[PDB]
């Protein structure tokens, strides 16, 4: 799946591979929810399950800093942090897509069902 993240690299013209993604959910403060790394295709499947993914405000943080530093590029953003309310009118499936540059990022959401 109900939460998928896809990341692309604007500098290299590739997927952003092995980038850390942390998801938090807003507590009664940000409580850890799930995390993972992108695959060779830039995708991260299997973050969560239908049973774990409840209504709430979620924060997806993509660790852009480590990713650029590891490629020998200077990162401006510390991380790319997408915050949204999920499932408020019923369960949906979300894809969070992000395009990364050293001084910019773009992000969109696809919401289904």
């Amino acid at each position: 799946c109900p939460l998928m993240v896809k990341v692309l690299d604007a500098v290299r013209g590739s997927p952003a591979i092995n980038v850390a993604v942390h998801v938090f959910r807003k507590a009664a403060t940000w409580e850890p929810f799930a995390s993972g790394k992108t695959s060779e295709s830039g995708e991260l499947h299997g973050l969560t399950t239908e049973e774990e993914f409840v209504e709430g405000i979620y924060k997806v943080e993509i660790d852009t800093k480590s990713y650029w530093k590891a490629l020998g590029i200077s990162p401006f953003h510390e991380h790319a942090e997408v915050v949204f309310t999920a499932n408020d009118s019923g369960p949906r499936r979300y894809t969070i897509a992000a395009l990364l540059s050293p001084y910019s990022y773009s992000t969109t959401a696809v919401v289904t069902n």
Copy 2:
């Protein structure tokens, strides 16, 4: 596949479904090369083949105008037109991704092999 196009809609939070995509190749003027429509997932596979996709300058035109008009939205851009040299140092596979808004578009490329 060697040329794939993926389109997303920033207004509706969905794939851009059934959007016309025309590809031209620069002639000895823009000669028609291939065209198609995006699927229910926003993707257009099967534009061309390894044997047809030669070196050249290619223009991918995404018909944003028809797409917005059909949804009852006012389009500013007539079309989103990505122009690139392909295969100059050998065959590669290209994915052209585009994110559409009425007054803006973002596009990136993923290049493999």
Copy 3:
């Protein structure tokens, strides 16, 4: 030393009267304001105050869209960077945003 600009990709206009909050990591509130008629927010800080460190610029996009009658995806366009004149620009759509920094 720090300017924020916000643009609306759906209407093709500056995003007016948008709340912008800036935090510095000790998140200490650091500066805030509302966008002008041009989509720009000047006068956030001073050179004396704006020291190197890690800043978050949080733009209240949700309130913006809701005032226009459009249901938005995000709570805010939130933007986190290490410092060390900065213009932070945000381009808004209901289900998307892009941000950049020009230094």
Copy 4:
């Protein structure tokens, strides 16, 4: 009536000395120039000349990246719109660009 601005997302700077060509559909060349130190190109046209119609703004991004020693994907960031003050902004990366219009 028509301004073009170009930003570099890799270096976090204005894109300086970039060629910009504007065409009007009869493609008739209509206006052109090079970006200034601020990444902006003013003085392209006049209110008398800038009539409603379909315009292409073509930004010579390839030459820009090549001067910096970076191999670029695109030939140009080309941008096509129906008119009817316009600022057309382009944010450049080697394998990507975003463009917007603020009217």
